[PDB]
Amino acid sequence: QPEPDMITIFIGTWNMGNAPPPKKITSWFLSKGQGKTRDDSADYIPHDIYVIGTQEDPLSEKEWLEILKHSLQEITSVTFKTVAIHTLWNIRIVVLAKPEHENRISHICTDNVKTGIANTLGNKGAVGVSFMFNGTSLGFVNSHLTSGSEKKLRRNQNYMNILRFLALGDKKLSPFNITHRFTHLFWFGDLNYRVDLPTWEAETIIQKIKQQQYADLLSHDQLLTERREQKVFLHFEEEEITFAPTYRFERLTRDKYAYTKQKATGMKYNLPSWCDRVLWKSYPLVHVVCQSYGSTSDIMTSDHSPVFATFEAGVTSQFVSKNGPGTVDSQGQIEFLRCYATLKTKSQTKFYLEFHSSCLESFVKSQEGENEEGSEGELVVKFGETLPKLKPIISDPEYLLDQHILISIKSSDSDESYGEGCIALRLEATETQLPIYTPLTHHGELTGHFQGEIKLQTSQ
Ligand SMILES: CN1CCN(C(=O)c2ccc(F)c(F)c2)CC1
Ligand SMILES: CN1CCN(C(=O)c2ccc(F)c(F)c2)CC1
């Protein structure tokens, strides 16, 4: 029975509005409704992994698991296994997998982050799950961010707190946050970004939605504009939105957007918005393709519609050679040549690098670099040809070309990371000096760049 090199992943996000779901929610898991929808000819084909995020979820874990599992068994005639379930207040994540994957999944982690302080602490935050699928690390975050049209900056702050403090994946990757710990990271939820148009324009917006003319609305979507300005979700992807705003509906129909201010809303307007979103970030040159992104039309218990997204995702096998794991394979080597980091910092410490990768027996510390001043005010840290030669556990190019090297640049004075990035070993050539590049971030914000050349020796 061969190990897969691709899987498909279902991501759902639904703010349930504190109401029990209707009796049938199968359209959600089938990617049917509005937007980029799934072909009918696929309806019986199970996804490999289903990841369900809810917000304002009124059900117990047991109650929701029974609905989810029996929904999937009805669609697929497969009884899924529960990988993980984690709940913070009314924010929940469920991961379900086909039974054939049970012994391919390991290292399951769960965590949550509570956002805000005093007043603003007690209902918003995030839950997440990570695990290994054979050789591939997968991370999933369901966040419910701060509400309100005039709180985009708070949402951005919530995002940074979640990626800083959510403790998922390999704890040995100590310099790295969740935006670098996984081959594939999916981040979804009620992100609560709004369409920023004047309140007076509510009926105009509704008109546009009824005509399926979303372009003049999406140009004012706060998540797209904040992403464009590099204020949030740096280096993440989102499929094009081709479905109607998913909030705020009158319950029990989808014919009416309920946008006017009420005591129940704190006297706030809720103009129609794409609150409910799926984004992802995968390591460079790993296969990931969005095959659906849309909303259901027939699930109407909430003031939000459910959102679905599905992905093809590249995965790798748990590789064994006669040498590694358990030793190095001297027919393999990774040389980082003529490298330099460009940093936005004003500090004047010396810096060193750490190289982290599951192709190494443990992380590798470099010597300190040589600081120079850049022509436009910057710090340039030069490493020359000084960098340690990295010794992979397995030399086989079928393994090594699928790997990645995480890089942290750390202060000698504090040992704190000033920037993190990732280099793919999916090179155009071996035994050949080739350019490499990564942006560097810290707490998810751009702090610099790392560039130079690589020379990879494999057994072939
Ligand atoms: C509640 N727990 C029970 C223990 N548990 C597993 O045994 C498990 C391991 C791998 C899988 F893929 C899977 F679906 C399940 C995870 C959930
Ligand atoms: C297919 N990908 C390639 C990478 N990518 C961008 O470079 C990007 C361009 C414009 C943006 F507003 C933004 F937020 C990001 C996202 C799309």
Curated annotation (Swiss-Prot):
Tissues where the protein occurs: Specifically expressed in immune and hematopoietic cells. Expressed in bone marrow and blood cells. Levels vary considerably within this compartment. Present in at least 74% of immature CD34+ cells, whereas within the more mature population of CD33+ cells, it is present in only 10% of cells. Present in the majority of T-cells, while it is present in a minority of B-cells (at protein level).
Quaternary data: Interacts with tyrosine phosphorylated form of SHC1. Interacts with tyrosine phosphorylated form of DOK1. Interacts with tyrosine phosphorylated form of DOK3. Interacts with tyrosine phosphorylated form of SLAMF1/CD150. Interacts with PTPN11 in response to IL-3. Interacts with receptor EPOR. Interacts with receptors MS4A2/FCER1B and FCER1G. Interacts with receptors FCGR2B and FCGR3. Interacts with receptor FCGR2A, leading to regulate gene expression during the phagocytic process. Interacts with GRB2. Interacts with PLCG1. Interacts with tyrosine kinases SRC and TEC. Interacts with c-Met/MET.
Coiled coil, from the record: none
Function (record text): Phosphatidylinositol (PtdIns) phosphatase that specifically hydrolyzes the 5-phosphate of phosphatidylinositol-3,4,5-trisphosphate (PtdIns(3,4,5)P3) to produce PtdIns(3,4)P2, thereby negatively regulating the PI3K (phosphoinositide 3-kinase) pathways. Able also to hydrolyzes the 5-phosphate of phosphatidylinositol-4,5-bisphosphate (PtdIns(4,5)P3) and inositol 1,3,4,5-tetrakisphosphate. Acts as a negative regulator of B-cell antigen receptor signaling.
Name recorded for this polypeptide: Phosphatidylinositol 3,4,5-trisphosphate 5-phosphatase 1
Natural source organism: Homo sapiens (Human)
Family: Belongs to the inositol 1,4,5-trisphosphate 5-phosphatase family.
Domain comment quoted from the record: The SH2 domain interacts with tyrosine phosphorylated forms of proteins such as SHC1 or PTPN11/SHP-2. It competes with that of GRB2 for binding to phosphorylated SHC1 to inhibit the Ras pathway. It is also required for tyrosine phosphorylation. The NPXY sequence motif found in many tyrosine-phosphorylated proteins is required for the specific binding of the PID domain.
Full-sequence range covered: 398 to 857 of 1189
Gene name of the encoded protein: INPP5D
Places the protein is found: Cytoplasm; Cell membrane; Membrane raft; Cytoplasm, Cytoskeleton
Signal peptide feature range: none
Maturation and modification: Tyrosine phosphorylated by the members of the SRC family after exposure to a diverse array of extracellular stimuli such as cytokines, growth factors, antibodies, chemokines, integrin ligands and hypertonic and oxidative stress. Phosphorylated upon IgG receptor FCGR2B-binding.
